[PDB]
Design an enzyme around this catalytic site. Structure first.
Site, PDB file in Angstrom:
ATOM      1  N   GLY A   1       0.966   5.106  11.405  1.00  0.00           N
ATOM      2  CA  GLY A   1       1.985   5.573  11.205  1.00  0.00           C
ATOM      3  C   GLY A   1       3.395   4.478  11.459  1.00  0.00           C
TER       4      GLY A   1
ATOM      5  CG  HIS B   1      -0.552   0.289   2.461  1.00  0.00           C
ATOM      6  ND1 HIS B   1      -0.512  -0.891   3.261  1.00  0.00           N
ATOM      7  CD2 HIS B   1      -0.217   1.299   3.237  1.00  0.00           C
ATOM      8  CE1 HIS B   1       0.078  -0.587   4.453  1.00  0.00           C
ATOM      9  NE2 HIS B   1       0.198   0.799   4.314  1.00  0.00           N
TER      10      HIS B   1
ATOM     11  CB  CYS C   1       2.280   0.940   7.736  1.00  0.00           C
ATOM     12  SG  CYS C   1       0.698   0.353   8.258  1.00  0.00           S
TER      13      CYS C   1
ATOM     14  CD  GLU D   1      -0.611  -4.318   1.817  1.00  0.00           C
ATOM     15  OE1 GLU D   1      -1.452  -4.885   0.842  1.00  0.00           O
ATOM     16  OE2 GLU D   1      -0.323  -3.125   1.854  1.00  0.00           O
TER      17      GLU D   1
END
Length: 182
Positions: A146, A41, A148, A72
Site C-alpha cells: 500500500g 507497475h 508503493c 521501475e
C-alpha cells in the site's frame, strides 16, 4: 518528530498528489512543472485520476537503464492547471548509500504516514515480481504493497520511490537528477 521528518513533511505537503490507475491508488511525487513519477507497475494509461480529478496524460515513459533493464520509474507529464514546486535540486546526482531515511506515504488507505526506515543500502539488482530491475535501494523495514510510490528522503535529499518488499525488507527505485533534465 525530528529534522528528517521535517524535510519529509515539507515534500509531502507541497510535492505529492494521490494518483489512481486501474491498478490502485499510489503516492505520486511531483518533481517540477507538470512532471511527476510513479512506479511502473501502476500501468499509467492515457487518463489518470489526480486527487480524484480525471486528468489527461500528456506523456508517460517507463525508464530503463542503458543495459535495457527495468528501473521501475515511470515519468508522467500531467495535463494539470498547476505546476509543482521545482525540487530537482534535492535529487542526488549519483548512485549512493544513505543513513537515517524516512519513507512517507499519503493515500486514502494510509494518510499522513511517515516511517523511519534507518540505513539505506545501494542494493543494485533485484528480481522484482519476476522482472530484473536495477538501481534498487534497500531498507530493513517490513513495508507492505500500500506504500508503493512512497517518497524516500534524507535531510535535504529526495532519493527514491518505494516499489516493493519481501516481508522483512523494502525496496525503492533511485531518483537521479539526470532523469529530469528538460
Amino acid at each position: 518528530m525530528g529534522p528528517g521528518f521535517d524535510f519529509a513533511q515539507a515534500i509531502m505537503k507541497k510535492n505529492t498528489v494521490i494518483a489512481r490507475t486501474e491498478k490502485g491508488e499510489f503516492t505520486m511525487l511531483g518533481v517540477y512543472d507538470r512532471v511527476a513519477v510513479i512506479p511502473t507497475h501502476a500501468s499509467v494509461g492515457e487518463i489518470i485520476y489526480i486527487n480524484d480529478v480525471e486528468t489527461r496524460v500528456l506523456d508517460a515513459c517507463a525508464l530503463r537503464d542503458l543495459t535495457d533493464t527495468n528501473l521501475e520509474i515511470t515519468i508522467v507529464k500531467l495535463d494539470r492547471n498547476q505546476k509543482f514546486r521545482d525540487i530537482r535540486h534535492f535529487l542526488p546526482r549519483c548512485e549512493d548509500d544513505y543513513n537515517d531515511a524516512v519513507l512517507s506515504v499519503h493515500t486514502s488507505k494510509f494518510p499522513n504516514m511517515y516511517i523511519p526506515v534507518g540505513q539505506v543500502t545501494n542494493y543494485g539488482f533485484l528480481n522484482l515480481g519476476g522482472t530484473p530491475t536495477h538501481r534498487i535501494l534497500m531498507y530493513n523495514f517490513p513495508t507492505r504493497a500500500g506504500q508503493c510510490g512512497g517518497v524516500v528522503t534524507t535531510t535535504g535529499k529526495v532519493i527514491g520511490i518505494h516499489v516493493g518488499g519481501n516481508g522483512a525488507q523494502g525496496f525503492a527505485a533511485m531518483l537521479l537528477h539526470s532523469y529530469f533534465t528538460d
